[PDB]
From a paper:
Here we report the biochemical characterization of the AA12 enzyme encoded by the genome of the ascomycete Trichoderma reesei (TrAA12). The three-dimensional structure of TrAA12 reveals important similarities with bacterial soluble glucose dehydrogenases (sGDH). TrAA12 preferentially oxidizes l-fucose, and weak activity was measured against d-arabinose (11.6% relative activity), d-galactose (5.7%), l-arabinose (2.8%), and d-lyxose (2.2%). Based on these results, the AA12 family of enzymes is likely to have a catalytic mechanism close to that of bacterial sGDH.
The three structures superimposed very well, and no major differences in the main chains were observed. All the structures solved present a constitutive calcium. The calcium ion presents a typical octahedral coordination. Three amino acids are directly involved in the coordination: Glu259 and Gln301 with their side chains and Tyr276 by the main chain. Three water molecules complete the coordination, stabilized mainly by the side chains of Glu238 and Asn26. Of the seven predicted N-glycosylation sites, five are visible in the density maps on Asn94, Asn147, Asn184, Asn306, and Asn341.
Author numbering: 28 to 200, 205 to 430
Write the structure that this text describes.
């Protein structure tokens, strides 16, 4: 019904994939989720939670017919989730995770129903607070929280609550203190993207790793350290959960080329930071810290991860590099997963990310490129995603 077009060289779809721009003019759209009524809720950062009414003509033929601001709150900056029954919306500021009653008869939120479920999350620099509600354990809410600086010493202290993911049984609800949740992982500089694999309920996160990396004082920031895919075990069990994934004393290797003191290190292995606390060595990184399951190209900046219904594929948004001479990212990629809920690629792979939508000319980014942020599936397996810098929502599907 509406003719919406991109204002930059359009994304390139891999063979077998098609897409359509369905919404424009949003302020800075981040997390997105469908409600029970087929409306798309958008966390529009600096505005609040917006609901988009869609007409669906099938395939990529969707049009926005109306938009409404459900929750007006300029402090909401990224995180959004909705209960499986559709009656509770969760959204986060830098400091607080709020729960609101959502009236799906009227598609309204009464602001007086707001309650704080998690608090004390405030810190500088990395200010997003991703929310994930478990499907396998529907009363479990995961909350991710990044570092206070590029290299944050408080991330060494687990009680600070910096650079870690926590889980809360919201059925047991004054709000939880952040560090009162179950520890899913710490030493996670800024793992904005957190998802659950339906094959087995495995918890996965994607990492925005350190900027300005040095190795024996040599600048190796152009191609290191890699971005990471981290595994946190099964929700409710302790196996492969609650460890320290290395920030800020250990980083993962992406590019071996010209890397000082490589030794026995391979792609995917973690090595000690030049600025690691006194006494930490490469060996400490091997024995005491948890390595990533897979690494990606340095600085692609992943922001969300969503699995399809079968659990055969995860989709990841690469929001794009900001400080690399030639830009990288600005894409949507897929990673293949096996029957045991783990990636089919080995941990030393440099080719695990398969291109779904890419920018045609990375030299133009980020000014003339989309910057994917949030993903969500609808009930029939179409993928929807936000581009915050461009104020856009897209639909994506196999043709
Ligand atoms: C949401 O709906 C409002 C109201 O229809 C839209 O605001 C209009 O935007 C158009 C340009 O697209 C203007 O020409 C109109 O004057 C605006 N109307 C009003 C009353 O403000 C808004 O653009 C829509 N936004 C989204 C994201 O759908
Ligand atoms: C790690 O972080 C925790 C955060 O709780 C620090 O504990 C606080 O320390 C400040 C300053 O010493 C005190 O004013 C608070 O009373 C402490 N809070 C608690 C819960 O006791 C701790 O000092 C930091 N250092 C560590 C523990 O290594
Ligand atoms: C280790 O910490 C030092 C902190 O000094 C970092 O070195 C800084 O790197 C930038 C280059 O991007 C220089 O402009 C600064 O001048 C350097 N030191 C300062 C601020 O005086 C180094 O990047 C860190 N190495 C990492 C993160 O691997
Ligand atoms: C186990 C199984 O049914 N595998 C399917 C796969 O063939 C299909 O390509 C995919 C599409 O998302 O969904 C899943
Ligand atoms: C948040 O931290 C303060 C200490 O700074 C603590 O007293 C409070 O209990 C924490 N949050 C809640 C609501 O427990
Ligand atoms: Ca790590």
């Amino acid at each position: 019904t509406n003719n919406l077009q991109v204002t930059y060289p359009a994304p390139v779809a891999a063979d077998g994939w098609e897409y359509r721009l369905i919404s424009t003019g949003l302020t800075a759209p981040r997390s997105i989720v469908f409600d029970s009524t087929g409306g798309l809720l958008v966390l529009d950062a600096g505005v609040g939670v917006r609901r988009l009414t869609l007409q669906d003509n099938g395939g990529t033929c969707l049009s926005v017919t109306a938009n409404a601001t459900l929750i007006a709150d300029t402090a909401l900056n990224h995180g959004l989730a909705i209960s499986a029954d559709g009656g509770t919306i969760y959204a986060s500021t830098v400091n607080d995770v709020y729960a609101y009653t959502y009236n799906e008869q009227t598609n309204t939120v009464d602001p007086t129903t707001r309650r704080t479920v998690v608090t004390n999350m405030t810190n500088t620099d990395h200010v997003t607070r991703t929310l994930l509600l478990s499907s396998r354990l529907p009363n479990e809410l995961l909350v991710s929280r990044g570092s206070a600086a590029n290299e944050d010493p408080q991330a060494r202290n687990v009680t600070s609550g910096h650079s870690q993911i926590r889980a809360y049984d919201i059925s047991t609800l004054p709000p939880f203190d952040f560090v009162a949740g179950t520890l899913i992982g710490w030493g996670l500089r800024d793992s904005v993207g957190v998802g659950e694999n339906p094959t087995n309920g495995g918890i996965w996160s994607v990492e925005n790793s350190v900027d300005d990396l040095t190795r024996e004082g040599v600048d190796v920031h152009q191609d290191n350290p890699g971005e990471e895919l981290n595994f946190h075990g099964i929700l409710g069990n302790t196996a492969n959960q609650g460890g320290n994934y290395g920030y800020p004393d250990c980083y993962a290797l992406w590019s071996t080329a010209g890397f000082p003191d490589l030794g026995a290190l391979e792609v995917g292995d973690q090595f000690a930071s030049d600025n690691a606390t006194a006494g930490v060595t490469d060996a400490t990184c091997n024995t005491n810290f948890v390595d990533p399951r897979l690494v990606f190209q340095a600085h692609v900046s992943p922001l969300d991860i969503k699995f399809n219904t079968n659990g055969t594929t995860a989709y990841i948004t690469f929001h794009g590099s900001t400080d690399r001479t030639t830009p990288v990212g600005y894409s949507i990629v897929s990673v293949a997963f096996g029957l045991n809920g783990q990636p089919t690629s080995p941990m030393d792979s440099t080719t695990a990310a398969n291109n779904i939508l890419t920018s045609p000319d990375l030299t133009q980014c980020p000014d003339d490129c989309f910057t994917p942020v949030g993903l969500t599936f609808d009930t029939i397996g179409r993928l929807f995603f936000s581009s915050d810098s461009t104020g856009e929502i897209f639909v994506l599907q196999q043709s």
